[PDB]
Amino acid sequence: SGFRKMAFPSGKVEGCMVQVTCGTTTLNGLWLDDVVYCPRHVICTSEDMLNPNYEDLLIRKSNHNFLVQAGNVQLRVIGHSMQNCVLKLKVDTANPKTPKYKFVRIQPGQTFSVLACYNGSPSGVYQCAMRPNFTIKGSFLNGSCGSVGFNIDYDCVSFCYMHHMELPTGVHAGTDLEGNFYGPFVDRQTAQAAGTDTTITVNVLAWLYAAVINGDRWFLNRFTTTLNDFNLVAMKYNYEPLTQDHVDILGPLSAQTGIAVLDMCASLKELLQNGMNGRTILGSALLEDEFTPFDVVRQCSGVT
Amino acid sequence: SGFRKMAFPSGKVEGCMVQVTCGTTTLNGLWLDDVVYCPRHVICTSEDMLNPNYEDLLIRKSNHNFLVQAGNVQLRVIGHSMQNCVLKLKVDTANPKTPKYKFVRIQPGQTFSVLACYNGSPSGVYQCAMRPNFTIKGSFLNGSCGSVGFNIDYDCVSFCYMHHMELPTGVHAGTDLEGNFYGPFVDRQTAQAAGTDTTITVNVLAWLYAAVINGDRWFLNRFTTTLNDFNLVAMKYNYEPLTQDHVDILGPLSAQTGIAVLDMCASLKELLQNGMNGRTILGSALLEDEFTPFDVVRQCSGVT
Ligand SMILES: *[C@]1(O)C(=O)N(Cc2ncon2)c2ccc(Br)cc21
Ligand SMILES: *[C@]1(O)C(=O)N(Cc2ncon2)c2ccc(Br)cc21
């Protein structure tokens, strides 16, 4: 009973957070085995950020210029390399708390937990989604760069995001753990604008299924629709178009509730056209799109 | 930049979760030092829950009837006692991962993180508030009892809640770590109704301050009000009355934004009277009341 925006338990990731300092810049790092991963802009001053040439700035750096502190103890840096927008600092000690892990590059619409950190110390955990415009709406302050996003499958942590930037609109941008940015963003203090932040239709549908499972059923209408008809409305309301791949992943939710996917589409279509009329679904006055169909299944089934 | 419903990092609490089984009933336990705390109804069958006499049911139980498993290893129970609605199982091994901790009984309106668990294993973390009617709107399924709620001050975990019950309306009820229920609820499968779930006014104001700090300023009106005038409106809209104690705790937010507390009250008064008019504040189409003034300060200042 009940439905919450829930993050993964963060312990496995807390045990990987370190502080990385290069000169006067301090950021967060992720220590997995004998490597510390961190944003490459840890080498920049505020002035360098306006127009950095990272390869050039890296020529002036040796292993001993990167200070890595795990808890209150210093790790010895024995190698360093730049991979896309991340630096990989080889340390002489494997992290004893390294969980089983993978690096995954997620698709727009996918959710993940963020462990917001400052000075290598965790401050909080929250749930995000990779927006269709490849930004995330996080909660980050100065020194948050290097905080990571992740999903957990039983005992394996799949790291999918590292925080690198804040757009002038207050939305956030970053990379996967191979240092490749999501979307067209660059790690530079230059004004970068985001594209249309459309609604993640398959996630809204999943959340409407979660609402039906938890008793909120007022919005269920007497209609059905087709994928093409639904998508004309989705396009008009800046919703992502729904594909048969999205219908497929909603199959278990359709099976549990007995509500055909296209019937839920028609109910969503009416909600877009009529609005909520001052009503709420799962305590929300708007349609929530940061629960994937897997998140709803996980939460509604009690996966640990 | 950005503002999120954020939970505390849960690692310190994950290291305390154990599974407790008594006969055929399995629930979660909290292992701190050499004691495991769990709901006393771990001794009940489904039939016992309809009308339990816990002292009587406890006469038939010895130390060896409580099976406590930490990870995949069995702890030896060397004592047991009932304190209000919790059982305390003395084990022969102190939890090596016991964080610094306290047991605190929170007041209505206070928020905390819940680490939802099943079979002693964490499934997710989310942020809750103790409602003014002493229920919480959690996300709990079968076997979730024994999951705890907590706050963290630097390195000290203040445990404030243990999950014991689900009301027939799907809202939740439980105790502090001394086993005393919040509100009038009893650990019995009998229909129990909740009182009026009013809005936590001081939390809404704190969240309006967070909105102003993050750039959402459309709702700021040209009015002021008094505590008495504001409270007439608060009472009409099922909002908690605002006291000078609440104005006091909003002082730092008032100072950071230059918006007097009573001016924010007048802006809230107009929002109650006019509604949102299809607009959102911090991505919400309703007024959020599960951020305390301390949560807003913590999040907006980056406390770790
Ligand atoms: C990154 O180094 C960092 O910590 N921040 C601060 C921030 N505030 C909000 O989101 N991030 C940051 C901002 C901009 C850049 Br180009 C890098 C960083
Ligand atoms: C408690 O033992 C438990 O795990 N549950 C299940 C539950 N589902 C949703 O919230 N809790 C429970 C329900 C009712 C009682 Br009286 C005790 C428990």
PDB file of N, CA and C in Angstrom, chain A residues 95-184:
ATOM      1  N   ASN A  95      39.750  -0.408  -3.343  1.00  0.00           N
ATOM      2  CA  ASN A  95      38.741  -0.039  -2.365  1.00  0.00           C
ATOM      3  C   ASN A  95      38.206  -1.301  -1.718  1.00  0.00           C
ATOM      4  N   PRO A  96      38.390  -1.463  -0.391  1.00  0.00           N
ATOM      5  CA  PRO A  96      37.902  -2.693   0.266  1.00  0.00           C
ATOM      6  C   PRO A  96      36.380  -2.870   0.223  1.00  0.00           C
ATOM      7  N   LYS A  97      35.664  -1.740   0.084  1.00  0.00           N
ATOM      8  CA  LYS A  97      34.202  -1.681   0.032  1.00  0.00           C
ATOM      9  C   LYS A  97      33.675  -1.668  -1.406  1.00  0.00           C
ATOM     10  N   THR A  98      34.496  -2.044  -2.424  1.00  0.00           N
ATOM     11  CA  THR A  98      34.014  -2.040  -3.803  1.00  0.00           C
ATOM     12  C   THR A  98      32.876  -3.053  -3.931  1.00  0.00           C
ATOM     13  N   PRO A  99      31.686  -2.588  -4.317  1.00  0.00           N
ATOM     14  CA  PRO A  99      30.594  -3.537  -4.540  1.00  0.00           C
ATOM     15  C   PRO A  99      30.763  -4.185  -5.916  1.00  0.00           C
ATOM     16  N   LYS A 100      29.918  -5.206  -6.247  1.00  0.00           N
ATOM     17  CA  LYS A 100      29.902  -5.728  -7.635  1.00  0.00           C
ATOM     18  C   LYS A 100      29.316  -4.589  -8.472  1.00  0.00           C
ATOM     19  N   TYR A 101      29.915  -4.307  -9.617  1.00  0.00           N
ATOM     20  CA  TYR A 101      29.468  -3.154 -10.383  1.00  0.00           C
ATOM     21  C   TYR A 101      29.631  -3.286 -11.862  1.00  0.00           C
ATOM     22  N   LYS A 102      28.904  -2.438 -12.582  1.00  0.00           N
ATOM     23  CA  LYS A 102      29.016  -2.309 -14.021  1.00  0.00           C
ATOM     24  C   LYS A 102      28.874  -0.836 -14.338  1.00  0.00           C
ATOM     25  N   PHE A 103      29.326  -0.440 -15.533  1.00  0.00           N
ATOM     26  CA  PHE A 103      29.135   0.912 -16.052  1.00  0.00           C
ATOM     27  C   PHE A 103      28.116   0.786 -17.176  1.00  0.00           C
ATOM     28  N   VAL A 104      26.986   1.514 -17.079  1.00  0.00           N
ATOM     29  CA  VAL A 104      25.965   1.408 -18.114  1.00  0.00           C
ATOM     30  C   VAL A 104      25.600   2.767 -18.614  1.00  0.00           C
ATOM     31  N   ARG A 105      25.382   2.878 -19.917  1.00  0.00           N
ATOM     32  CA  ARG A 105      24.964   4.148 -20.491  1.00  0.00           C
ATOM     33  C   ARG A 105      23.478   4.012 -20.674  1.00  0.00           C
ATOM     34  N   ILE A 106      22.713   4.819 -19.954  1.00  0.00           N
ATOM     35  CA  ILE A 106      21.262   4.706 -19.993  1.00  0.00           C
ATOM     36  C   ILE A 106      20.637   5.478 -21.161  1.00  0.00           C
ATOM     37  N   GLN A 107      19.370   5.156 -21.424  1.00  0.00           N
ATOM     38  CA  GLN A 107      18.592   5.775 -22.467  1.00  0.00           C
ATOM     39  C   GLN A 107      17.714   6.857 -21.851  1.00  0.00           C
ATOM     40  N   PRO A 108      17.323   7.874 -22.635  1.00  0.00           N
ATOM     41  CA  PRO A 108      16.392   8.879 -22.105  1.00  0.00           C
ATOM     42  C   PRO A 108      15.114   8.196 -21.617  1.00  0.00           C
ATOM     43  N   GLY A 109      14.633   8.638 -20.475  1.00  0.00           N
ATOM     44  CA  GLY A 109      13.441   8.071 -19.859  1.00  0.00           C
ATOM     45  C   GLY A 109      13.768   7.160 -18.697  1.00  0.00           C
ATOM     46  N   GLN A 110      15.000   6.623 -18.692  1.00  0.00           N
ATOM     47  CA  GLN A 110      15.448   5.758 -17.606  1.00  0.00           C
ATOM     48  C   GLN A 110      15.706   6.570 -16.316  1.00  0.00           C
ATOM     49  N   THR A 111      15.286   6.018 -15.180  1.00  0.00           N
ATOM     50  CA  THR A 111      15.455   6.628 -13.867  1.00  0.00           C
ATOM     51  C   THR A 111      16.692   6.021 -13.175  1.00  0.00           C
ATOM     52  N   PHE A 112      17.175   6.690 -12.149  1.00  0.00           N
ATOM     53  CA  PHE A 112      18.301   6.219 -11.373  1.00  0.00           C
ATOM     54  C   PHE A 112      18.369   7.011 -10.110  1.00  0.00           C
ATOM     55  N   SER A 113      19.116   6.504  -9.131  1.00  0.00           N
ATOM     56  CA  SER A 113      19.298   7.216  -7.881  1.00  0.00           C
ATOM     57  C   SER A 113      20.565   8.041  -7.954  1.00  0.00           C
ATOM     58  N   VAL A 114      20.574   9.209  -7.325  1.00  0.00           N
ATOM     59  CA  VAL A 114      21.762  10.059  -7.264  1.00  0.00           C
ATOM     60  C   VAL A 114      22.135  10.164  -5.812  1.00  0.00           C
ATOM     61  N   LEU A 115      23.418   9.944  -5.491  1.00  0.00           N
ATOM     62  CA  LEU A 115      23.888  10.156  -4.135  1.00  0.00           C
ATOM     63  C   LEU A 115      24.623  11.494  -4.191  1.00  0.00           C
ATOM     64  N   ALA A 116      23.967  12.599  -3.802  1.00  0.00           N
ATOM     65  CA  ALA A 116      24.578  13.928  -3.865  1.00  0.00           C
ATOM     66  C   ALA A 116      25.687  13.992  -2.814  1.00  0.00           C
ATOM     67  N   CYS A 117      26.886  14.417  -3.202  1.00  0.00           N
ATOM     68  CA  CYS A 117      28.057  14.452  -2.329  1.00  0.00           C
ATOM     69  C   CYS A 117      28.756  15.738  -2.389  1.00  0.00           C
ATOM     70  N   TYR A 118      29.427  16.096  -1.282  1.00  0.00           N
ATOM     71  CA  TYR A 118      30.275  17.284  -1.198  1.00  0.00           C
ATOM     72  C   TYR A 118      31.540  16.880  -0.450  1.00  0.00           C
ATOM     73  N   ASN A 119      32.723  17.206  -1.009  1.00  0.00           N
ATOM     74  CA  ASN A 119      33.977  16.862  -0.335  1.00  0.00           C
ATOM     75  C   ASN A 119      34.121  15.344  -0.071  1.00  0.00           C
ATOM     76  N   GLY A 120      33.590  14.543  -0.981  1.00  0.00           N
ATOM     77  CA  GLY A 120      33.611  13.096  -0.856  1.00  0.00           C
ATOM     78  C   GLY A 120      32.657  12.523   0.176  1.00  0.00           C
ATOM     79  N   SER A 121      31.792  13.368   0.775  1.00  0.00           N
ATOM     80  CA  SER A 121      30.828  12.969   1.798  1.00  0.00           C
ATOM     81  C   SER A 121      29.392  13.038   1.301  1.00  0.00           C
ATOM     82  N   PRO A 122      28.630  11.944   1.476  1.00  0.00           N
ATOM     83  CA  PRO A 122      27.228  11.935   1.023  1.00  0.00           C
ATOM     84  C   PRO A 122      26.315  12.861   1.820  1.00  0.00           C
ATOM     85  N   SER A 123      25.484  13.655   1.140  1.00  0.00           N
ATOM     86  CA  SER A 123      24.527  14.533   1.827  1.00  0.00           C
ATOM     87  C   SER A 123      23.080  14.053   1.702  1.00  0.00           C
ATOM     88  N   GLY A 124      22.766  13.307   0.649  1.00  0.00           N
ATOM     89  CA  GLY A 124      21.397  12.836   0.454  1.00  0.00           C
ATOM     90  C   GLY A 124      21.233  11.979  -0.767  1.00  0.00           C
ATOM     91  N   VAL A 125      20.113  11.289  -0.880  1.00  0.00           N
ATOM     92  CA  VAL A 125      19.859  10.425  -2.023  1.00  0.00           C
ATOM     93  C   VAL A 125      18.505  10.731  -2.587  1.00  0.00           C
ATOM     94  N   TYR A 126      18.424  10.788  -3.910  1.00  0.00           N
ATOM     95  CA  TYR A 126      17.145  11.074  -4.549  1.00  0.00           C
ATOM     96  C   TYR A 126      17.018  10.385  -5.866  1.00  0.00           C
ATOM     97  N   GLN A 127      15.806  10.325  -6.393  1.00  0.00           N
ATOM     98  CA  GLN A 127      15.539   9.642  -7.632  1.00  0.00           C
ATOM     99  C   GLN A 127      15.414  10.655  -8.759  1.00  0.00           C
ATOM    100  N   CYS A 128      16.058  10.367  -9.897  1.00  0.00           N
ATOM    101  CA  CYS A 128      16.125  11.198 -11.114  1.00  0.00           C
ATOM    102  C   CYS A 128      15.659  10.400 -12.305  1.00  0.00           C
ATOM    103  N   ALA A 129      15.464  11.082 -13.425  1.00  0.00           N
ATOM    104  CA  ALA A 129      15.263  10.412 -14.699  1.00  0.00           C
ATOM    105  C   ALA A 129      16.126  11.156 -15.706  1.00  0.00           C
ATOM    106  N   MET A 130      16.679  10.424 -16.667  1.00  0.00           N
ATOM    107  CA  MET A 130      17.415  11.039 -17.769  1.00  0.00           C
ATOM    108  C   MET A 130      16.329  11.642 -18.651  1.00  0.00           C
ATOM    109  N   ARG A 131      16.246  12.986 -18.739  1.00  0.00           N
ATOM    110  CA  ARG A 131      15.162  13.613 -19.508  1.00  0.00           C
ATOM    111  C   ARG A 131      15.319  13.323 -20.995  1.00  0.00           C
ATOM    112  N   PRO A 132      14.236  13.423 -21.790  1.00  0.00           N
ATOM    113  CA  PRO A 132      14.367  13.184 -23.232  1.00  0.00           C
ATOM    114  C   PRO A 132      15.347  14.151 -23.912  1.00  0.00           C
ATOM    115  N   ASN A 133      15.618  15.328 -23.290  1.00  0.00           N
ATOM    116  CA  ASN A 133      16.604  16.285 -23.807  1.00  0.00           C
ATOM    117  C   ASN A 133      18.026  16.048 -23.205  1.00  0.00           C
ATOM    118  N   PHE A 134      18.227  14.910 -22.521  1.00  0.00           N
ATOM    119  CA  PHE A 134      19.475  14.462 -21.914  1.00  0.00           C
ATOM    120  C   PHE A 134      20.009  15.339 -20.785  1.00  0.00           C
ATOM    121  N   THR A 135      19.121  16.071 -20.136  1.00  0.00           N
ATOM    122  CA  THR A 135      19.473  16.797 -18.922  1.00  0.00           C
ATOM    123  C   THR A 135      18.838  15.966 -17.755  1.00  0.00           C
ATOM    124  N   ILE A 136      19.186  16.280 -16.509  1.00  0.00           N
ATOM    125  CA  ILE A 136      18.491  15.712 -15.350  1.00  0.00           C
ATOM    126  C   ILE A 136      18.105  16.908 -14.462  1.00  0.00           C
ATOM    127  N   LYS A 137      17.016  16.778 -13.721  1.00  0.00           N
ATOM    128  CA  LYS A 137      16.601  17.847 -12.822  1.00  0.00           C
ATOM    129  C   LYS A 137      17.034  17.362 -11.446  1.00  0.00           C
ATOM    130  N   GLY A 138      18.285  17.638 -11.111  1.00  0.00           N
ATOM    131  CA  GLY A 138      18.836  17.209  -9.839  1.00  0.00           C
ATOM    132  C   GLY A 138      18.714  18.284  -8.787  1.00  0.00           C
ATOM    133  N   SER A 139      19.472  18.117  -7.731  1.00  0.00           N
ATOM    134  CA  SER A 139      19.536  19.087  -6.663  1.00  0.00           C
ATOM    135  C   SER A 139      21.008  19.093  -6.315  1.00  0.00           C
ATOM    136  N   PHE A 140      21.737  20.056  -6.876  1.00  0.00           N
ATOM    137  CA  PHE A 140      23.185  20.095  -6.742  1.00  0.00           C
ATOM    138  C   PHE A 140      23.660  21.473  -6.433  1.00  0.00           C
ATOM    139  N   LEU A 141      24.646  21.582  -5.572  1.00  0.00           N
ATOM    140  CA  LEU A 141      25.236  22.864  -5.232  1.00  0.00           C
ATOM    141  C   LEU A 141      26.736  22.844  -5.616  1.00  0.00           C
ATOM    142  N   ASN A 142      27.472  23.911  -5.273  1.00  0.00           N
ATOM    143  CA  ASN A 142      28.900  23.988  -5.550  1.00  0.00           C
ATOM    144  C   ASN A 142      29.670  22.811  -4.891  1.00  0.00           C
ATOM    145  N   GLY A 143      30.542  22.166  -5.659  1.00  0.00           N
ATOM    146  CA  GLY A 143      31.292  21.022  -5.161  1.00  0.00           C
ATOM    147  C   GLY A 143      30.589  19.685  -5.319  1.00  0.00           C
ATOM    148  N   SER A 144      29.382  19.674  -5.950  1.00  0.00           N
ATOM    149  CA  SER A 144      28.620  18.445  -6.145  1.00  0.00           C
ATOM    150  C   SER A 144      29.135  17.612  -7.305  1.00  0.00           C
ATOM    151  N   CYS A 145      29.926  18.208  -8.227  1.00  0.00           N
ATOM    152  CA  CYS A 145      30.450  17.470  -9.360  1.00  0.00           C
ATOM    153  C   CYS A 145      31.208  16.235  -8.921  1.00  0.00           C
ATOM    154  N   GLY A 146      30.990  15.154  -9.632  1.00  0.00           N
ATOM    155  CA  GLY A 146      31.576  13.879  -9.248  1.00  0.00           C
ATOM    156  C   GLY A 146      30.577  12.991  -8.528  1.00  0.00           C
ATOM    157  N   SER A 147      29.434  13.560  -8.062  1.00  0.00           N
ATOM    158  CA  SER A 147      28.355  12.739  -7.461  1.00  0.00           C
ATOM    159  C   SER A 147      27.843  11.811  -8.591  1.00  0.00           C
ATOM    160  N   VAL A 148      27.475  10.551  -8.271  1.00  0.00           N
ATOM    161  CA  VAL A 148      27.078   9.619  -9.299  1.00  0.00           C
ATOM    162  C   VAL A 148      25.608   9.191  -9.187  1.00  0.00           C
ATOM    163  N   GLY A 149      25.100   8.678 -10.291  1.00  0.00           N
ATOM    164  CA  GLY A 149      23.763   8.135 -10.447  1.00  0.00           C
ATOM    165  C   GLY A 149      23.916   6.653 -10.684  1.00  0.00           C
ATOM    166  N   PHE A 150      22.965   5.870 -10.176  1.00  0.00           N
ATOM    167  CA  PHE A 150      23.104   4.433 -10.266  1.00  0.00           C
ATOM    168  C   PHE A 150      21.792   3.711 -10.133  1.00  0.00           C
ATOM    169  N   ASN A 151      21.798   2.464 -10.564  1.00  0.00           N
ATOM    170  CA  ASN A 151      20.710   1.509 -10.353  1.00  0.00           C
ATOM    171  C   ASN A 151      21.343   0.295  -9.673  1.00  0.00           C
ATOM    172  N   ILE A 152      20.542  -0.502  -8.955  1.00  0.00           N
ATOM    173  CA  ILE A 152      21.069  -1.704  -8.311  1.00  0.00           C
ATOM    174  C   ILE A 152      20.245  -2.898  -8.726  1.00  0.00           C
ATOM    175  N   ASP A 153      20.895  -3.975  -9.176  1.00  0.00           N
ATOM    176  CA  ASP A 153      20.232  -5.247  -9.441  1.00  0.00           C
ATOM    177  C   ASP A 153      20.788  -6.237  -8.406  1.00  0.00           C
ATOM    178  N   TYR A 154      19.979  -6.542  -7.375  1.00  0.00           N
ATOM    179  CA  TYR A 154      20.284  -7.400  -6.230  1.00  0.00           C
ATOM    180  C   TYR A 154      21.550  -6.917  -5.488  1.00  0.00           C
ATOM    181  N   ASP A 155      22.750  -7.350  -5.922  1.00  0.00           N
ATOM    182  CA  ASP A 155      24.010  -6.948  -5.282  1.00  0.00           C
ATOM    183  C   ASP A 155      24.974  -6.215  -6.227  1.00  0.00           C
ATOM    184  N   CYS A 156      24.542  -5.962  -7.475  1.00  0.00           N
ATOM    185  CA  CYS A 156      25.362  -5.311  -8.486  1.00  0.00           C
ATOM    186  C   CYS A 156      24.924  -3.854  -8.724  1.00  0.00           C
ATOM    187  N   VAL A 157      25.854  -2.902  -8.534  1.00  0.00           N
ATOM    188  CA  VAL A 157      25.583  -1.484  -8.769  1.00  0.00           C
ATOM    189  C   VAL A 157      25.903  -1.126 -10.206  1.00  0.00           C
ATOM    190  N   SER A 158      24.906  -0.658 -10.987  1.00  0.00           N
ATOM    191  CA  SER A 158      25.163  -0.214 -12.358  1.00  0.00           C
ATOM    192  C   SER A 158      25.242   1.300 -12.305  1.00  0.00           C
ATOM    193  N   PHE A 159      26.448   1.825 -12.436  1.00  0.00           N
ATOM    194  CA  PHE A 159      26.652   3.270 -12.416  1.00  0.00           C
ATOM    195  C   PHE A 159      26.316   3.798 -13.787  1.00  0.00           C
ATOM    196  N   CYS A 160      25.467   4.824 -13.852  1.00  0.00           N
ATOM    197  CA  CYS A 160      25.059   5.368 -15.142  1.00  0.00           C
ATOM    198  C   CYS A 160      25.327   6.847 -15.325  1.00  0.00           C
ATOM    199  N   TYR A 161      25.687   7.582 -14.260  1.00  0.00           N
ATOM    200  CA  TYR A 161      25.809   9.034 -14.381  1.00  0.00           C
ATOM    201  C   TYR A 161      26.850   9.557 -13.437  1.00  0.00           C
ATOM    202  N   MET A 162      27.548  10.604 -13.848  1.00  0.00           N
ATOM    203  CA  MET A 162      28.421  11.371 -12.987  1.00  0.00           C
ATOM    204  C   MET A 162      28.078  12.822 -13.286  1.00  0.00           C
ATOM    205  N   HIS A 163      27.893  13.611 -12.237  1.00  0.00           N
ATOM    206  CA  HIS A 163      27.507  14.993 -12.388  1.00  0.00           C
ATOM    207  C   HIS A 163      28.667  15.851 -12.846  1.00  0.00           C
ATOM    208  N   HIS A 164      28.497  16.630 -13.941  1.00  0.00           N
ATOM    209  CA  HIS A 164      29.579  17.502 -14.434  1.00  0.00           C
ATOM    210  C   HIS A 164      29.195  18.930 -14.597  1.00  0.00           C
ATOM    211  N   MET A 165      27.895  19.226 -14.727  1.00  0.00           N
ATOM    212  CA  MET A 165      27.529  20.574 -15.056  1.00  0.00           C
ATOM    213  C   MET A 165      26.144  21.010 -14.676  1.00  0.00           C
ATOM    214  N   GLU A 166      25.991  22.328 -14.554  1.00  0.00           N
ATOM    215  CA  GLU A 166      24.738  22.982 -14.294  1.00  0.00           C
ATOM    216  C   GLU A 166      24.506  23.964 -15.448  1.00  0.00           C
ATOM    217  N   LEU A 167      23.378  23.842 -16.141  1.00  0.00           N
ATOM    218  CA  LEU A 167      23.037  24.753 -17.230  1.00  0.00           C
ATOM    219  C   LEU A 167      22.573  26.066 -16.630  1.00  0.00           C
ATOM    220  N   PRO A 168      22.672  27.183 -17.375  1.00  0.00           N
ATOM    221  CA  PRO A 168      22.219  28.464 -16.810  1.00  0.00           C
ATOM    222  C   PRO A 168      20.752  28.473 -16.354  1.00  0.00           C
ATOM    223  N   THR A 169      19.926  27.500 -16.799  1.00  0.00           N
ATOM    224  CA  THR A 169      18.527  27.364 -16.357  1.00  0.00           C
ATOM    225  C   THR A 169      18.359  26.561 -15.048  1.00  0.00           C
ATOM    226  N   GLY A 170      19.455  26.061 -14.489  1.00  0.00           N
ATOM    227  CA  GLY A 170      19.396  25.303 -13.251  1.00  0.00           C
ATOM    228  C   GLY A 170      19.149  23.823 -13.431  1.00  0.00           C
ATOM    229  N   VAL A 171      19.068  23.335 -14.681  1.00  0.00           N
ATOM    230  CA  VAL A 171      18.968  21.899 -14.928  1.00  0.00           C
ATOM    231  C   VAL A 171      20.410  21.382 -15.011  1.00  0.00           C
ATOM    232  N   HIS A 172      20.589  20.059 -14.947  1.00  0.00           N
ATOM    233  CA  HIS A 172      21.920  19.487 -14.819  1.00  0.00           C
ATOM    234  C   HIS A 172      22.327  18.584 -15.986  1.00  0.00           C
ATOM    235  N   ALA A 173      23.645  18.443 -16.179  1.00  0.00           N
ATOM    236  CA  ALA A 173      24.182  17.631 -17.249  1.00  0.00           C
ATOM    237  C   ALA A 173      25.429  16.900 -16.768  1.00  0.00           C
ATOM    238  N   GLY A 174      25.650  15.739 -17.347  1.00  0.00           N
ATOM    239  CA  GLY A 174      26.784  14.925 -16.962  1.00  0.00           C
ATOM    240  C   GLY A 174      27.012  13.778 -17.898  1.00  0.00           C
ATOM    241  N   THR A 175      27.880  12.877 -17.469  1.00  0.00           N
ATOM    242  CA  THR A 175      28.345  11.826 -18.329  1.00  0.00           C
ATOM    243  C   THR A 175      27.975  10.459 -17.794  1.00  0.00           C
ATOM    244  N   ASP A 176      28.216   9.418 -18.594  1.00  0.00           N
ATOM    245  CA  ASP A 176      28.192   8.058 -18.094  1.00  0.00           C
ATOM    246  C   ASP A 176      29.601   7.847 -17.427  1.00  0.00           C
ATOM    247  N   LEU A 177      29.900   6.635 -16.929  1.00  0.00           N
ATOM    248  CA  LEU A 177      31.177   6.416 -16.238  1.00  0.00           C
ATOM    249  C   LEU A 177      32.360   6.188 -17.198  1.00  0.00           C
ATOM    250  N   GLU A 178      32.101   6.232 -18.527  1.00  0.00           N
ATOM    251  CA  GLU A 178      33.154   6.285 -19.536  1.00  0.00           C
ATOM    252  C   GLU A 178      33.483   7.734 -19.940  1.00  0.00           C
ATOM    253  N   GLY A 179      32.845   8.712 -19.292  1.00  0.00           N
ATOM    254  CA  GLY A 179      33.132  10.108 -19.541  1.00  0.00           C
ATOM    255  C   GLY A 179      32.427  10.734 -20.714  1.00  0.00           C
ATOM    256  N   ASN A 180      31.488  10.010 -21.349  1.00  0.00           N
ATOM    257  CA  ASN A 180      30.756  10.574 -22.473  1.00  0.00           C
ATOM    258  C   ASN A 180      29.519  11.273 -21.971  1.00  0.00           C
ATOM    259  N   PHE A 181      29.355  12.535 -22.324  1.00  0.00           N
ATOM    260  CA  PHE A 181      28.179  13.286 -21.906  1.00  0.00           C
ATOM    261  C   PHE A 181      26.915  12.662 -22.455  1.00  0.00           C
ATOM    262  N   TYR A 182      25.847  12.797 -21.680  1.00  0.00           N
ATOM    263  CA  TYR A 182      24.533  12.517 -22.170  1.00  0.00           C
ATOM    264  C   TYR A 182      24.127  13.806 -22.890  1.00  0.00           C
ATOM    265  N   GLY A 183      23.688  13.654 -24.129  1.00  0.00           N
ATOM    266  CA  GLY A 183      23.282  14.806 -24.910  1.00  0.00           C
ATOM    267  C   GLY A 183      24.475  15.569 -25.444  1.00  0.00           C
ATOM    268  N   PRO A 184      24.199  16.772 -25.938  1.00  0.00           N
ATOM    269  CA  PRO A 184      25.251  17.532 -26.637  1.00  0.00           C
ATOM    270  C   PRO A 184      26.150  18.422 -25.781  1.00  0.00           C
TER     271      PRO A 184
END
